[PDB]
């Protein structure tokens, strides 16, 4: 992703579905006047890797008129993965494969004049470049919905933007949205994880409270003679003698207590 | 009877359509074409082994 002459140039990597075969493209125009991205027909055989899931290289192989770039003058081939340099997410095209006669982009020496259409812009961070204020906004095809020459704050002003970000005291400032961040290892330690049920995943973390039938006699004996040790199932309760009760997310490796 | 029937049979278009049951015998041999899930030399079940 870089700028020149008013438009974007992006490096990308075309790939078969199994990522067996690959082609780098250095400077490609990002042009949102193409409904679908166009490649030279010759690559169709270069990118075809016949795996197990796709016995023939591609899932979709057909013929389309494809007169948009310049009666079946081209071929729709899918799905070919595409990795653009900026983005973390692969974008999956079903591109137009065009022969020399239909359209020939040899345009300058060694230069193949490839470009990226809205096929691939819809799937990237590049899409946010398509909204008002972005760098592709100038190149959108003319609409009732898209005003060409308006200043940004004019446009957003019509959509209801009034002041700058969090400028009025009534709206909380963005960075107090997250104040504390919880990381067990850095503070207070891990939780004490118990279960009542079949597994850790099938049961509740909770023990049963003091009000249980079987716990009442025990808890009684435990309140009256506090110092001697007492038999019972009243041990399994959430309530007990010690100041530290058993309830979920006790931090037991914490220094205090 | 045979003749009238052949006539009105050949006249209808829903015929001239292959009938898997009427037309052939899939397999004439008493043993199967490939091994399906029968106990092994060790006595282990079909589910316990891959051929």
């Amino acid at each position: 992703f870089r700028m020149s002459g008013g438009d974007m140039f992006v490096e990308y990597k075309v790939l078969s579905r199994d990522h067996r075969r690959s082609i780098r493209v250095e400077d490609a125009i990002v042009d949102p006047t193409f409904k679908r991205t166009v490649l030279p027909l010759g690559w169709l055989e270069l990118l075809r890797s016949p795996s197990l899931r796709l016995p023939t290289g591609y899932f979709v192989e057909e013929t389309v008129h494809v007169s948009l770039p310049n009666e079946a003058n081209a071929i729709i081939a899918g799905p070919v993965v595409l990795y653009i340099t900026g983005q973390s997410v692969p974008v999956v095209l079903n591109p137009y494969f065009v022969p020399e006669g239909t359209w020939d982009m040899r345009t300058r020496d060694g230069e193949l004049d490839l470009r990226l259409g809205m096929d691939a812009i819809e799937q990237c961070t590049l899409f946010s470049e398509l909204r008002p204020g972005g760098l592709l906004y100038g190149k959108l095809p003319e609409n009732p919905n898209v005003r060409r020459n308006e200043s940004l704050r004019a446009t957003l002003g019509r959509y209801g933007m009034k002041c700058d970000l969090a400028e009025s005291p009534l709206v909380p400032r963005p960075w107090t949205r997250m104040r504390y961040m919880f990381i067990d290892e850095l503070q207070r330690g891990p939780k004490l994880t118990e279960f009542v049920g079949h597994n850790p995943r099938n049961g509740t973390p909770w023990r049963f409270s003091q009000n249980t039938k079987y716990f009442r006699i025990g808890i009684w004996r435990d309140t009256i003679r506090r110092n001697d040790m007492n038999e019972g199932l009243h041990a399994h309760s959430s309530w007990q003698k010690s100041p530290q009760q058993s309830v979920p997310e006790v931090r037991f490796l914490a220094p205090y207590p | 009877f045979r003749d009238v029937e052949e006539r009105r049979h050949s006249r209808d278009v829903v015929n001239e359509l292959p009938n898997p049951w009427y037309d052939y015998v899939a397999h004439a041999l008493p043993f199967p074409d490939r091994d399906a899930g029968y106990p092994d030399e060790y006595g282990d079940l079909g589910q316990w082994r891959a051929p």
């Binding site: - | 009877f1 009238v4 006539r7 009105r8 050949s10 006249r11 278009v13 001239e16």
Partner: protein, 238 residues
């Protein structure tokens, strides 16, 4: 005897049987009273039709059950007289309210059970108005004329020949069936014209005719005159 112990057949329509001591006992412990909240007659804002379908004479006779004693959900099986087709049956109110259950004849009222109103077929009053007079007269003949001409409704008709009453199907009488359903017998129209007892004689006329002409009868005749560009496959005979 022995065979008395056998459980009856329970076809697909019918739910739980309650034929065993285990199946009877827990419901035996339910005792209903009719309060103001349970009484059918209070609820006529909704269930008015259900109220006008009850046999008020017969239920109090046979069952000793008053009409003011009948709950909207009542489990007891009481007698009904259908206000559409006019046939009598015995069911519980609970089953007519919880889902719609009612006279068994009006189940087949529409031309197909699977799709209730999906018919595009005209009523009987239109397609074959000459049928409406052959219906045995219970006074409901204006409701029965309203049905689809394709309807599978089982209706009773007074036979032309002997003036007695038999029971056949509306669509069997007209002969017309809806696209995608099963074809009836090609002759069904001529054959249901009369009683099952009166039908033989008239339909044996054309056969005697055809053995009078050629001195020989084969059922083939119709198909033959059906005979007096069909795409066909390539064959492997060669």
């Amino acid at each position: 005897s022995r065979w008395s112990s056998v459980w009856p057949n329970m076809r697909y329509g019918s739910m739980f049987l309650s034929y065993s001591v285990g199946r009877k006992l827990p419901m035996k412990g339910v005792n209903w009273v009719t309060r103001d909240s349970n009484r059918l007659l209070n609820f006529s804002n909704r269930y008015s039709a259900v109220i006008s379908d009850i046999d008020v004479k017969r239920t109090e006779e046979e069952l000793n059950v008053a009409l003011s004693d009948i709950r909207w959900n009542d489990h007891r099986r009481i007698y009904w007289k259908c206000s559409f087709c006019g046939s009598s049956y015995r069911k519980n109110v609970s089953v007519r309210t919880k889902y719609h259950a009612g006279c068994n004849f009006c189940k087949k009222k529409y031309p197909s059970e699977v799709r209730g109103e999906q018919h595009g077929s005209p009523p009987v009053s239109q397609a074959a108005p000459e049928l409406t007079e052959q219906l045995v007269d219970n006074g409901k003949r204006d409701n029965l004329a309203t049905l689809a001409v394709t309807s599978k409704f089982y209706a009773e008709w007074t036979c032309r020949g002997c003036g007695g009453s038999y029971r056949s199907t509306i669509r069997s009488r007209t002969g017309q069936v809806e696209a995608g359903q099963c074809t009836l017998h090609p002759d069904i129209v001529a054959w249901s014209a009369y009683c099952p007892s009166c039908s033989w004689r008239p339909n044996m006329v054309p056969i005697a005719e055809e053995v009078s002409r050629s001195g020989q009868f084969l059922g083939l005749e119709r198909s033959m005159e059906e005979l007096g560009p069909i795409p066909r496959r390539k064959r492997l005979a060669c």
